[PDB]
Design a protein around this ligand. Structure first.
Ligand SMILES: C[C@H]1COCCN1c1nc(-c2cnc(N)cc2C(F)F)nc(N2CCOCC2)n1
Length: 847
């Protein structure tokens, strides 16, 4: 049909590749994913039309609210008698005159009540037919949340800024919601446990090799047996035809058992050449058998062993690569993995205060710590009691002998009834260590029960990353994330961008491609907007490309203006939403304000006019830095962890104002960076006005009177935070231009080159002089840094988990758990609270 064709062209433009290539993929699991994945879209759409227009508006404009409505102590103290002042605006008449009505109401009031008292104040000079909007952006207070719980409101309370809201008619916004229609695509309409034996695979011959074959059977990151090398053979004729046998009985193969193979070379000095992984069981629970042609992959940078089991699974798309032919045993009938029922029949067929405390002490340990064999057998012999302390489940999982059908089954049964655990702990079971399907299933259930959309968005990038660790295209995690993204555009955005940014990586081109297809096919009119965005970025990447090649600094600016002035460019880079925050409208380019940043890598400084009716109450211009050339993933993770830390200190009662500015990777070493209005570098303050005593003076001039004190406070608190943080994360070398301060005293860092590889933030005499060595102010400062350090050491588990999940991404500074152990060093996990305290005190003495 017509709608089908158009939708296909647009989806092709958004994903980057045309849909018609997915069709030509003669692969059962691919087609069955593209089809079977559709009832998730159905569920989401049904949820969208369930309450009709209100449900739609909620789908497009979800409430940006904190996780818990409760407010910390100091935050509540910011309120005058537990109340808040709020300015509600109204546009009226043909001239759209703006009239303001100020109010003082309880911070726990519902937006409906705010509208009530607002109309009351408007008449003293009509029921709930109105909704509240944020003056200057596209945020709406559509749900009956307490106003203070909205991120915008709580922020306004902490910063001391007064909220400016706009009263809008419900029908004026509903009239803006398009009538979407999800059209179904045109592409929608045995022995088991008996096999007794040992695993043996035959390698036949290799092609495209102009050395031996090392192989192994692994369960995630652990080999279910010993690796076996095939007979060394001359490189000219790649013909082994050999039969390798493994010390693993066929029934004893876990559900997620994988074959990991590679081709090593011989000078003595061994070096891999091409790697590949195969699922012993397919997506229909069948067991591999017969011949199979597997196209291998080149080796990633920084490889330790002659095997890459953590690498993606499947046959290389580029068939013009080393292709290995394998031969699996074929038995009487098509063998399947037993049903959970038979697992229960074989499962059923197959204690002192001292150790009662020992188990607790074990569960208290962090994930990085290793578990000894005696401790593994210990936890296993105590597998039933470990159910009362559910947070020990990960370590318990690590104690199972996954090469024994018995233990595997009994563990399955222990999972079918295991108590749910908190999300932060549930994600721990979603990294590469836990590849089992029922384990990841349990974790996904936990996330479905206790994960707030706030926390989901906060932990989105990691989840999208652990997608790569899934054994099959169609799984529970992908369906959960996809439904959440098809019911919450605030999540669907960074879902689509986290996915698209890696469409250049052929390791996951297929997966993320199909997923992105199913998403774009059911996301609604927003697809259009995304396309516009994808075009804008497109154009940008072109220009920067021509800037870093043909005209690779004043001439660069001239050329840039001329290319930018072309109408194609003007249209394609005007009137679209900010990929950093889709609530931000970006209208006409203010070219007179755009420029090349003249620092390194030719950063592009872009300035747009804010088209919002009330753009003046937020910012009349939105400035962003398009950078093409520098990998932004590391910066994304760093800023994320900074926001999380800030939320921890706030939820703990110490106001250390951090600044986790935006930062979104949208492709291969391309991305956007949020501009912090009114900020300058240390070196810039030192310049205007070798010298190290004019920072305090500059701040004093920029903050005269009763403001002075306030300013100081900020610069202190923030500073302390950015100190502690930078010490724990081991951020790269800081200097006078890596650091920045705002005209109000806010201090924050930028450009986190490399982390986890030592006191980087050696507070210079500037900062110290700004805080007051022997002064009560410095004492309060030290107390702050100590408190913060403790607060973070109390979530070392969370952070370590986050990194362990981010391993899947090919970031250089994060290639193995060895890189993560650094945090285990700086946090003093193996020591006690006091021991770690002395550790941080002494570490901070080393000026
Ligand atoms: C715009 C400001 C204020 O808002 C916060 C962001 N800021 C900022 N970020 C960066 C940056 C950080 N991280 C990266 N991975 C890459 C970059 C890239 F832009 F180079 N660089 C700069 N430079 C501009 C002034 O001259 C020298 C420094 N400024």
């Amino acid at each position: 049909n017509r709608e089908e064709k158009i939708l296909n062209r647009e989806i092709g433009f958004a994903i980057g590749m045309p849909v018609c290539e997915f069709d030509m993929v003669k692969d059962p699991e691919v087609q069955d994913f593209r089809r079977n994945i559709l009832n998730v879209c159905k569920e989401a759409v049904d949820l969208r039309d369930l309450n009709s227009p209100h449900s739609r508006a909620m789908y497009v404009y979800p409430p940006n609210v904190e996780s818990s409505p409760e407010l910390p102590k100091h935050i509540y103290n910011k309120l005058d008698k537990g109340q808040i002042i709020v300015v509600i605006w109204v546009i009226v008449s043909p001239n759209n005159d703006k009239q303001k009505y100020t109010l003082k109401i309880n911070h726990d009031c519902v937006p409906e009540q705010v509208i009530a008292e607002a109309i009351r104040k408007k008449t003293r000079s009509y029921q709930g037919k109105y909704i509240l909007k944020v003056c200057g952006c596209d945020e709406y207070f559509l749900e009956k949340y307490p106003l203070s719980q909205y991120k915008y409101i709580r922020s306004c309370i902490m910063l001391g800024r007064m909220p400016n809201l706009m009263l809008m008619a419900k029908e004026s916004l509903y009239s803006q919601l398009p009538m979407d229609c999800f059209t179904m695509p045109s592409y929608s309409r045995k022995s088991l446990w008996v096999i007794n034996s040992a695993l043996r695979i035959k390698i036949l011959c290799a092609t495209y090799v102009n050395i031996y074959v090392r192989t192994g059977i692994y369960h995630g990151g652990e080999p279910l047996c010993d690796n076996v090398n095939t007979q060394r053979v001359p490189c000219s004729n790649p013909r082994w035809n050999e039969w390798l046998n493994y010390d693993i009985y066929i029934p004893d193969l876990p559900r997620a058992a994988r074959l990991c193979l590679s081709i090593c070379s011989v000078k003595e000095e061994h070096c891999p050449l091409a790697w590949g992984n195969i699922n012993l069981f397919d997506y229909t629970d069948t067991l591999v058998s017969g011949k199979m042609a597997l196209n291998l992959w080149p080796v990633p940078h920084g490889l330790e062993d002659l095997l890459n089991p953590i690498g993606v699974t499947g046959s290389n798309p580029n068939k013009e690569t080393p292709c290995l032919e394998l031969e699996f045993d074929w038995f009487s009938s098509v063998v399947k993995f037993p049903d959970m029922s038979v697992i229960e029949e074989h499962a059923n067929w197959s204690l002192r205060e001292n150790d009662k405390e020992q188990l607790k002490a074990i569960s208290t340990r962090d994930p990085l710590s290793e578990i000894t064999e005696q401790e593994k057998d210990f936890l296993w012999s105590h597998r039933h009691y470990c159910v009362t302390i559910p947070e020990i489940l990960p370590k318990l999982l690590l104690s199972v002998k996954w090469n024994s059908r018995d233990e595997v089954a009994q563990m399955y049964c222990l999972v079918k009834d295991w108590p749910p655990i908190k999300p932060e702990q549930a994600m721990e079971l979603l990294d590469c260590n836990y590849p089992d399907p029922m384990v990841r299933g349990f974790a996904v259930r936990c996330l479905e029960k206790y994960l707030t959309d706030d926390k989901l968005s906060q932990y989105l990038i990691q989840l999208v990353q652990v997608l790569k660790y899934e054994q099959y295209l169609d799984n529970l995690l992908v369906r959960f994330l996809l439904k959440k993204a098809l019911t919450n555009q605030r999540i669907g955005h960074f879902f689509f961008w986290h996915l698209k940014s890696e469409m250049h990586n052929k390791t996951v081109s297929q997966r993320f491609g199909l997923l992105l297809e199913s998403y774009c096919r059911a996301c609604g009119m927003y697809l259009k907007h995304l396309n516009r965005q994808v075009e804008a970025m497109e154009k940008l990447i072109n220009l920067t490309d021509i800037l870093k090649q043909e005209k690779k600094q004043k001439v660069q600016m001239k050329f840039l203006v001329e290319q930018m002035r072309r109408p194609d460019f003007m249209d394609a880079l005007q009137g679209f939403l900010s990929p950093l925050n889709p609530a931000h409208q970006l209208g006409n380019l203010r070219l007179e304000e755009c420029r090349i940043m003249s620092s390194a890598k030719r950063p592009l400084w872009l300035n747009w006019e804010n088209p919002d009716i009330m753009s003046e109450l937020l910012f009349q211009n939105n400035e962003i830095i398009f950078k093409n050339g520098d990998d932004l993933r590391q910066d994304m993770l760093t800023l994320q962890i900074i926001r999380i830390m800030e939320n921890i200190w706030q939820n703990q009662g110490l106001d250390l104002r951090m600044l986790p500015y935006g930062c979104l990777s949208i492709g291969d070493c391309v991305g956007l960076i949020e501009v912090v209005r009114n900020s300058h570098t240390i070196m810039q303050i030192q310049c205007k006005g070798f010298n190290s005593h004019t920072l305090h003076q500059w701040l004093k001039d920029k903050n005269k009177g009763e403001i002075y004190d306030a300013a100081i406070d900020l610069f202190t608190r923030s500073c302390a935070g950015y100190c502690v943080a930078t010490f724990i994360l081991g951020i790269g070398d800081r200097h006078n231009s890596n650091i920045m301060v705002k005209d109000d005293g806010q201090l924050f860092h930028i450009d986190f080159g490399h982390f986890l590889d030592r006191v980087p933030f050696v507070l210079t005499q500037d900062f110290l002089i700004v805080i007051s060595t022997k002064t009560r102010e410095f004492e309060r400062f030290q107390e702050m840094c100590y408190k913060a350090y403790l607060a973070i050491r109390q979530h070392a588990n969370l952070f370590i988990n986050l990194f362990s999940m981010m391993l899947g991404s090919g970031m250089p500074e994060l290639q193995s758990f060895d890189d993560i152990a650094y945090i285990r060093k700086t946090l003093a996990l193996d020591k006690t609270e006091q021991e770690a305290l002395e550790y941080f005190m002494k570490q901070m003495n080393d000026a």
